[PDB]
Write a protein that binds this ligand. Structure first.
Ligand SMILES: COc1cc2c(cc1OC)[C@@H](Cc1ccc(Oc3cc(C[C@@H]4c5cc(OC)c(OC)cc5CCN4C)ccc3OC)cc1)N(C)CC2
Ligand SMILES: COc1cc2c(cc1OC)[C@@H](Cc1ccc(Oc3cc(C[C@@H]4c5cc(OC)c(OC)cc5CCN4C)ccc3OC)cc1)N(C)CC2
Lengths: 714, 714
């Protein structure tokens, strides 16, 4: 009956789901890895049937490993690139040891008895990518680009020789690009398999940041058992210099390198490079440093000449979302733009002239899934039904629209190569996970996972239920939230409240989807738990989110206080016992709200909080606030330091000391400012821990601390 | 009527005392620094009379400063060396700008209108030392020795060339020597003013250690306002290499440098050098790495030859207190030795023959004050009366012993240049501070200070009273301690208990001397506060102190546990409500006691605490434990890590992150192990703070947190 935190932090209630699902190039099958990690099995999109195991560790020849982590197909589906020994660097980048496995069928009718081959004789590799004809793979190692010709007995050549750690990176983004522009690779083949193009990052003039490493446990870093070590990398703080970037091309046949004559600002960005279906046109997406002039260029890989193709200006800032929704077809490309105050899908010609605006209306397109070149149709995801919901929609050449999703809540799709079939994951507040196959009309072909077992297990526990709600601020805005009530609820009783939030620009934590979390536990202990996404939050247009431009956190704090006051109006809430917490931007938000000047909170917890935006990185910070030189007062009014003396309530700072995102510096400096103000607070710092704050019993330790802190300060 | 914590932390109740009393060469007078530090004034030992003002900032000529911090008289009495702009480095080293003030009476007959002179036209100087005749001064700057000839224009010469930071130190100890042998100088003139001797420390192959520095506040480290920086220094953890040391002599007339041919162990120590009354005998004191063999060598500054004069072997270790109690007379020198199980005074010929053991008994001689060569009288200090007490004693040429100290308590003496008079600073639990002037025989000639108006101020508040007691552990050992009860105590009521302790090898906290501390405030808040010195502590002989050898902490934790059980038996104590606290070893002893096994402590605070001796430095740690390799089992049995699973009570860890003595690494690693064990606990980390944890509001902040933790955990 009773909910145990250990089961939660353990992931005991984690819904079953298929992992490692990769669409085959055929358009009719998908593959998934086995639970063991010993096999890649090919299943069918139309029926869900298993077809055969295409790869097996205990069946290959020359296969030394016995587990692999991930894999991709060659464009035509006869080779596999299988990744082993995957080792994280940052959130998106990793090294791995890759093997090429051919899928030819042998004299017994199977594909599983073939000879594995190594991608490279040297050390582990990064971001390997097939050429369009499947005959070549480029990867990056030690900040240099290497090319393997598979038609030449995997002949390896070195395409770049300038890379150095903390100086020059070839093909892979630096730290801040990788995190805030969302990518791990800037390395492309041309349509005709004759050129390679890549971004080159001179980061040598970027500041260096370092933090201590100890031995710690889980993992224990044994060489540091007596004397500590450190981590050193380039990380540009707000207003400081970013990497100098250039786009270069390598003529495979002639071994020649060229530098595209790209007329961008000295301090500009080059978030992506993507080769088009034109082998003589390479798309280069550029931003100005204000990040509000998206300039898409087409560059000629030989002439080095670049022609401006499109510009999307915003009165605020372009968002990273947009770049990867730009898919290139033989005659056209796609684009996601908020130019009309909402995220919508524009269809453009390869000459730069608009063709069609495919969507419109007061709602947000979230993803562009693809364009079916057979029936003229567009497939995308959207929140048209509710901001809290996501569904899958089709629009045909004639402009008729059809909602493919069959249930209401959150729908996440994965289409086949041909776009004939797709695999849907559905969830909502009551449905943990419904995985199905579906056709292009959305008709259900088969239910793959339905999670009977989890529900039955849950049916024996007293789980508090979330219900959405809405309320109106004092100046007239309607905000969405959810409330979880303890299981013997009674509006004659008076309850404490824990508010959770994130509140970061463009984010949403109030969604019609399913989770049991630490907040579920708190409610099972007798706490009303609320969450309200306020101003600056996503899903409701550019206006709702970008009201915070140049002065962030202020309006978010005012709406968190608004939520506290609305709840204090309810007869069943005890206004002297509201607490607030959050993580990342949310920890910042706990700070801002608790020191907003209106003394409505009794306790709060700030986990890995930025405290003054001059400590955080260029791309994210500047997108919203500009440089400190240009926006001094905004920095002043957006800083937790400025309003610290008005802090009211008891605080718990929680930070990991090996946080390479929000630096521990934030916590150190803010804590010292609170010590000089004379404010009493509490601390919990975790050794060798990152932004995630995980490792062994770390998370159970952490959530037990939060539970104790709020039980004691109420 | 109510004691305030701000008055404790701001030193409102500090007893009045005298500064800078330096006996003059006359044998009849002393000099002291004026209250405001603008005047150096002469006084008579016999009458207490102000005789004249030697120096006055307001009267001196061409004097740019308005304040000074210290002064050193010339051996002849001709000149004064004034120290201004005193800037600490570590705990005993510092740089200051020094001035030579001539002391010649004018036409008016006064010595207060002469032109002050700079010692060096260059930069700040360290440990400046006079030559016996007073015509020369040696000092250190930038790790190099400099000589100034006063007879010849105050001319400066450079004795040494190879000083490099973090590599070669000349005349000054490296970090660990300064801290654990307790000295700041290794730089001396021969008796005939012809030679300089010094220790040359080569610390190049000593491990570097480093920790982050932020901007902080009070002081704010301004260049670190965006990017942190670091502090780096040499620091060998236990069993790592120490400095390569060697003695050197510089010929003042011929500029020749020689190195003494000294048969010391490759891993041995030279804790001190000292010139004797014979100009051709330099005494070098040497230890082995086990610090259990003390070897006194006499060395020829010109032949480089070295003759072993003395060998003192201890079964445990030699204590530091011997080194500075070796005083050289024309035919004899002094020595303190624990050979007899107690610290006693031995009188040796300058040929190495023992002449006599001057003291005997079951008591310890703490300091050797001197020898009156006129009447063959010895003067020293001792706890003969009680381990809690300290008194001045005389022993004449026939062996008659006479306690000089009139009152019982703690008596601290300062003698005249002739041993014919001495100033006495007396205190005990009921007496804040008596400063008197006394004679050879011990009579009180005058009472300079009685600290009456402090007794006045205090009467107005309810100050809890300390009182001593003893108790017997379950194995017959009797322990000394004090108990402080709240000014409204009733045997009818049950009270909660706060135990303070330090417990480090050789130390005493239960002493008959006066203080108002944080513990006094807790007592005024309703706590019975107890301090108990347990096994391992000083005052009672080598057997009782050094029973902990090779396995530290275990028996000290046992006796704190016994203290808790004994208090729990008392009819007026709530045994479910007892707490423990400490700083340094004291914090380590908080740790060890709270995880001893017998779960008696409800709460506890550990400030700046060590947690595994493999983290701590070479000299201190190896003195009691030897190296981690030789004593692995002892290191494992003494680790706070090894017993961490048995930790009981709520614990607060408090550390300064810039702690250069107990590295914050101790805190990080111990906290991590407690996380992986699932032990909840609290943290308070102080930014940019060292072992003493101070600056701006810091202390007022720290002690408030400690108050609340104990109020909240009872
Ligand atoms: C919803 O809040 C967040 C939203 C957003 C962000 C971070 C957030 O909060 C850290 C960041 C992106 C970002 C995401 C994760 C990040 O570092 C980690 C954080 C956690 C904490 C783990 C978690 C994990 C996530 O996925 C990896 C996540 O995705 C948005 C959110 C959260 C939060 C809760 N949970 C406690 C675990 C592992 C991590 O790296 C291995 C560092 C940065 N951008 C601003 C995008 C929107
Ligand atoms: C009984 O305790 C101690 C004894 C002993 C030690 C340290 C102790 O306790 C930190 C160390 C010597 C030592 C002394 C001080 C040190 O760092 C500082 C600590 C404090 C804290 C200030 C304090 C100050 C002292 O003198 C300076 C002191 O001497 C007995 C004890 C204490 C206590 C706390 N009080 C709150 C203030 C300033 C400091 O450096 C400028 C670092 C090391 N050696 C092993 C000798 C015996």
């Amino acid at each position: 009956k009773a909910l145990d935190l250990k089961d939660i932090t353990s992931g005991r209630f984690r819904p079953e789901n298929i992992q490692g699902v990769i669409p085959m190039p055929d358009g009719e099958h998908y593959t998934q890895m086995s639970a063991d990690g010993t096999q890649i099995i090919k299943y069918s999109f139309r029926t869900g049937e298993k077809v055969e195991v295409i790869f097996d560790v205990n069946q290959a020849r020359e296969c030394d490993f016995k587990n692999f982590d991930s894999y991709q197909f060659s464009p035509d589906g006869d080779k596999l690139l299988i990744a082993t020994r995957t080792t994280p660097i940052y959130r998106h980048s990793y090294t791995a040891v890759h093997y090429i496995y051919p899928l030819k069928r042998n004299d017994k009718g199977v594909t599983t008895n073939n000879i594995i081959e190594r991608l490279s004789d040297g050390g582990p590799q990064q971001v390997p990518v097939f050429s369009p004809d499947g005959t070549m793979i480029a990867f990056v190692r030690d900040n240099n680009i290497f090319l393997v010709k598979l038609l030449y007995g995997n002949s390896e050549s070195q395409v770049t020789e300038d890379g150095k750690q903390n100086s020059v990176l070839n093909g892979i983004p630096d730290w801040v690009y990788e995190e805030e522009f969302g990518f791990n690779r800037a390395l492309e083949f041309s349509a005709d398999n004759t050129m390679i193009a890549f971004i080159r990052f001179d980061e040598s003039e970027v500041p260096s940041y370092s933090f201590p490493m100890f031995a710690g446990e889980a993992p224990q870093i044994t060489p540091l058992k007596d004397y500590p070590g450190e981590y050193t990398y380039k990380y540009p703080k707000a207003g400081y210099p970013n990497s100098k970037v250039e786009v270069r091309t390598y003529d495979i046949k002639s071994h020649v390198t060229r530098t595209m004559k790209l007329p961008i600002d000295a301090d500009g960005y080059i978030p992506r490079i993507r080769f088009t279906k034109d082998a003589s046109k390479l798309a280069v997406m550029t931003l100005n440093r204000h990040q509000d002039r998206f300039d898409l260029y087409f560059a000629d890989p030989r002439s080095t000449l670049c022609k401006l193709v499109l510009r999307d200006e915003s009165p605020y800032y372009i968002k990273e979302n947009v770049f990867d929704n730009i898919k290139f077809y033989p005659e056209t490309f796609s684009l996601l733009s908020e130019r009309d105050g909402f995220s919508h899908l524009y269809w453009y010609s390869m000459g730069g002239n608009l063709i069609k605006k495919v969507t419109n209306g007061k709602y947000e397109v979230k993803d562009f899934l693809g364009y079916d070149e057979a029936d003229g149709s567009f497939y995308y995801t959207s929140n048209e039904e509710s901001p809290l919901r996501k569904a899958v929609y089709k629009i045909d050449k004639k402009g008729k629209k059809l909602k493919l999703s069959q249930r209401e809540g959150t729908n996440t799709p994965l289409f086949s190569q041909s776009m004939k079939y797709y695999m849907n994951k559905f969830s909502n507040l009551d449905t943990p996970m419904l995985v199905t196959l579906n056709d292009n009309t959305g008709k259900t072909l088969k239910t793959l996972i339905n999670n009977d077992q989890l529900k039955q297990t849950l049916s024996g526990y007293a789980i508090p239920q979330k219900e959405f709600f809405t309320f109106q601020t004092t100046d007239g805005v309607t905000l969405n939230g959810w409330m979880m009530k303890p299981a013997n609820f009674s509006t004659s009783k008076k309850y404490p409240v824990l508010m959770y939030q994130y509140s970061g620009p463009g984010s949403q934590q109030v969604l019609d989807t399913w989770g049991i979390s630490w907040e579920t536990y708190m409610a099972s202990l007798g706490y009303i738990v609320v969450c309200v996404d306020g101003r600056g939050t996503g899903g409701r247009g550019e206006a709702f989110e970008k009201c915070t431009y140049l002065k962030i956190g202020v309006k978010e704090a005012k709406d968190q206080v608004e939520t506290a006051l609305y709840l204090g109006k309810q007869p069943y809430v005890d206004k002297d016992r509201i607490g607030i917490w959050g993580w990342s931007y949310g920890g910042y938000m706990t700070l801002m709200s608790m020191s907003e000047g209106t003394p409505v909170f009794k306790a709060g917890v700030a986990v890995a909080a930025p405290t003054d935006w001059r400590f955080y990185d260029t791309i994210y910070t500047e997108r919203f606030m500009r440089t400190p030189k240009e926006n001094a007062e905004g920095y002043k009014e957006s800083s937790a330091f400025t309003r610290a003396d008005k802090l009211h309530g008891n605080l718990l700072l929680v930070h990991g000391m090996a946080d390479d995102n929000v630096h521990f510096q934030n916590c150190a400096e803010y804590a010292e400012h609170l010590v000089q103000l004379g404010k009493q607070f509490d601390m919990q710092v975790y050794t060798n821990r990152n932004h995630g704050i995980y490792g062994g019993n770390t998370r159970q330790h952490l959530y037990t601390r939060l539970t104790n802190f709020f039980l004691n300060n109420l």
